[PDB]
Amino acid sequence: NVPTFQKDAYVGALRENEPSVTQLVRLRATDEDQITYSIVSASAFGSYFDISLYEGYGVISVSRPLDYEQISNGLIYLTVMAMDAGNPPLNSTVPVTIEVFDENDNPPTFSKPAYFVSVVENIMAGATVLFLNATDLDRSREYGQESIIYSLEGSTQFRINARSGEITTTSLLDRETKSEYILIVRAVDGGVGHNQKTGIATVNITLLDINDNHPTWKDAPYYINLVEMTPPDSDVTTVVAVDPDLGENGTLVYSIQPPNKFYSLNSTTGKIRTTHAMLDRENPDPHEAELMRKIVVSVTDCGRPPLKATSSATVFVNLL
Residue ranges in contact with Na ion by CB under 5 A: 174, 176, 212
CB of 39 to Ca ion, least distance (A): 23
CB of 173 to Na ion, least distance (A): 7
CB of 120 to Ca ion, least distance (A): 9
Question: Does residue 69 belong to the site contacting Ca ion (CB under 5 A)?
Answer: yes
Between 9 and 124, CB nearer to Ca ion: 124
H or E stretch at 1: none
Q: How far apart are the first and last CA of the chain?
A: 136
Rounded Cα distance between 249 and 205, Å, is: 21
Phi/psi of residue 209, nearest 5 degrees = -75, 140
The partner in contact with residue 174, picked from Ca ion, Na ion, none with C-beta cut-offs of 5 to 8 angstroms by kind, is: Na ion
Between 37 and 217, CB nearer to Ca ion: 217
Options 4-12, 82-90, 237-245, 284-292: segment touching Ca ion (CB under 5 A): 237-245
Q: In what order do the strands lie in the sheet with 166-169?
A: 128-131, 166-169, 158-160
Between 253 and 277, CB nearer to Ca ion: 253
Please list every residue from 104 through 163 that binds Ca ion, using CB under 5 A. Answer: 104-106, 136, 138, 143
The partner in contact with residue 150, picked from Ca ion, Na ion, none with C-beta cut-offs of 5 to 8 angstroms by kind, is: none
Question: Does residue 67 belong to the site contacting Ca ion (CB under 5 A)?
Answer: yes
Between 119 and 277, CB nearer to Ca ion: 119
Strand partners, 314: 296
The partner in contact with residue 69, picked from Ca ion, Na ion, none with C-beta cut-offs of 5 to 8 angstroms by kind, is: Ca ion
Question: Does residue 300 belong to the site contacting Ca ion (CB under 5 A)?
Answer: no
Nearest residue to 295 via CA among 276, 268, 318? 318
Between 174 and 280, CB nearer to Na ion: 174
Question: Does residue 102 belong to the site contacting Ca ion (CB under 5 A)?
Answer: yes
Identify residue 216 by its one-letter amino acid code. T
Cis amide leading into 113 (omega within 30): no
Work out whether the CA dihedral 229, 261, 224, 270 comes out positive or negative: negative
Q: Of 24, 29, 71, 213, which lies in the binding site for Ca ion, with binding defined by CB under 5 A?
A: 213
Between 289 and 302, CB nearer to Ca ion: 302
Question: Does residue 84 belong to the site contacting Ca ion (CB under 5 A)?
Answer: no
Nearest residue to 188 via CA among 173, 199, 203? 199
CB of 121 to Na ion, least distance (A): 5
Rounded Cα distance between 312 and 270, Å, is: 13
Q: Is residue 129 classed exposed, middle or buried when 0-12, 13-18 and 19+ CB atoms within 10 A define those classes?
A: buried
Between 84 and 209, CB nearer to Ca ion: 209
Nearest residue to 273 via CA among 240, 239, 314, 233? 233
Give the footprint of Ca ion on this chain (CB under 5 A): 16, 67-69, 102-106, 136, 138, 143, 175, 189, 209-213, 243, 245, 249, 301
